[PDB]
Subunit: 208 residues, 4 copies
């Protein structure tokens, strides 16, 4: 079994992205039988697609789990739908703000996630990790790589399970927002890392 | 040196209060030289005063730090003011909802906290624990024991340093609010317990 | 030109639904040349589809604008996507909580709204009405009638423009939440009614 | 009877302050028998005190009602306590950020508002205006003029009733926050202006 876990580099003035450090910490580990591969994608439209399609070609994983920073979210949000659109409020890391573009012209409006999302969520809960089902992943880079990967799954037969997990801020990133009058929700790094490993595990008890 | 730490029992339909477990975990420990005493107060107007005045009489602490559950807060809130008023929205644990009462008739409108609150906050930050100064402690039981203790300090000469710390929900308490459509901020138990020990330590580097 | 405007009856313990009163206030009026029809649908899965398909059959409108109460929203939210799913958190008004059902089995995952949503939003703004594009309509009755209507548009050729608008609470509904410790955003009735007539007007300058 | 109503000029990057326009709209009107005077104060520490003490000297009002913009509040908040402290997060309009200063050295820690605040709140509610009792006015300019005026009342015998009202944003100010990714609560200008006149009226049925 081969399992891809991606995370992103820091974007829009974040000094840090907790998902980069999750991609890197799950890289090369094995959950029993299954090899896990962890890769960090650019927050750059175009380049992220390119890098993601090479990686899926090269590893050809059975389960792909894409992870992102969802600022101001208070729990682990498990994504239900990727939609065929970019409408970037902020620019990707190269300066490209893209308003109202399809991701794949002619490809479906939307794709549902193939991860067992309610089981993942229920498991997280009995681990005492607060989690819920999100119904929008935005229309920036999370939804973009969440859509391109459910599309390659549909087009090429692999990955077999694909989806997206949004994690809160970690505590160490809150303490300079406090500074400009703001205190967002956070979640410890350790809870987040564990949440994406509990996810990998209910994905494997399902995907055969 | 003697240090009191209080926490409260669960109130208003919480199954758990993280501050009860913090009172109990700091009880009997020693931070160097200083003995720490941890006591859990009732969320019962009247009875909490009684219990708190006996304890301050019996231990006669140099530093008193009172800790409470602040539901929906996203960070450790360090309290600046206790005010002379009850206006309970919900009832205390015995059924007493008290609207617009003074705590001590004739006593001052307000008391400022004697804890080094900005230093505490600054230390918490460099520990990567998100923290801020709160300017209202409500007008229920946190403000009641926060005022009664700044009053005994003013009346009797001890404690020398007194204040209040509000902690978020812990994660294990969020997962049934998710159930009734709500996901509040949470903070890990371990971050909270550490935050109140980093507080005890900057209090002692100050109080001589 | 014929224009359908729907609103819903009160649901889940709301004493009132502002959209029922908007359906009823735009009924029978004319914006120039165009006749406007206002109808109130049930918040009852099944029955709402039935009632909505009869109405579209009987009026055969060129523009259909479906309006709902979005509790806790602070502005007029103009909906981008209806998705093929019910996952009701609360029960519809008859007692049916439906978890994970398709609306139309075999029909597309999603439909984009055919209303000129950015122009509507930009117009609202220059009218000083705060408005934004929402990317999820839930998976209760708003998304259900928002999807059934973009599906009849796709299946039957009419309506030509279809979409959904979510309005805040009106002020008179906030004052009893204050009572159980909550104060949600509200918007005046009059701002809301005006917002859906500014919408009808940029829809008609577009739809020929 | 003489009634002072103050409002503030725009501060910290607000293009507008709705309270300036309320001070100006109630100026010179009469509620029956009672003359109402409306004055706009600077958001400048020092200068606001000066201007407010001249005005109270010159009008010598029986009721003073001080009104301010509370950004991000969703309802009319009626203030309970002015406290003797500045701790400005942002600078006043002249560049002075003042951290941890007393307003009046030697004067009381706090003052309770003399307005009949629950009656005001109850009346607002039966007018369908959402309103609640706030327990902190910040430690910038609202709390500063809210304290200076409860202090002149205590020192000089007039005003007889004094307090502070915090109003939400008005809608026209929300539409450029939407732009930088934010949509705060708003309240229509008209609801706000009416709320401070319903206040003046329950203050006069009380103050003799």
């Amino acid at each position: 079994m081969k399992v891809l876990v991606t995370g992103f580099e820091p974007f829009g003035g974040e000094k840090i992205n907790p998902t980069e450090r999750i991609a890197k910490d799950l890289d090369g580990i094995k959950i029993g039988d299954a090899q896990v591969f962890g890769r960090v994608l650019p927050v750059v439209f175009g380049k992220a697609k390119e890098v993601l399609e090479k990686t899926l070609e090269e590893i050809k994983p059975d389960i792909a789990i894409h992870v992102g920073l969802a600022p101001g979210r208070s729990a682990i949000s498990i994504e239900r739908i990727a939609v065929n659109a970019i409408d970037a409020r902020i620019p990707d890391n190269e300066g490209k703000k893209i308003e109202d573009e399809p991701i794949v012209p002619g490809a479906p409006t939307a794709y549902f996630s193939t991860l067992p999302i309610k089981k993942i969520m229920k498991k997280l809960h009995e681990r005492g990790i607060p989690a819920y089902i999100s119904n929008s992943a935005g229309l920036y880079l999370s939804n973009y790589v969440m859509y391109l990967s459910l599309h390659h799954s549909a087009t090429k037969g692999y990955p077999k399970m694909s989806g997206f997990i949004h994690v809160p801020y970690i505590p160490e990133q809150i303490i300079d927002k406090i500074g400009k009058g703001q205190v967002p929700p956070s979640m410890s790094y350790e809870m987040e890392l564990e949440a994406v490993k509990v996810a990998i595990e209910v994905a494997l008890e399902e995907l055969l």
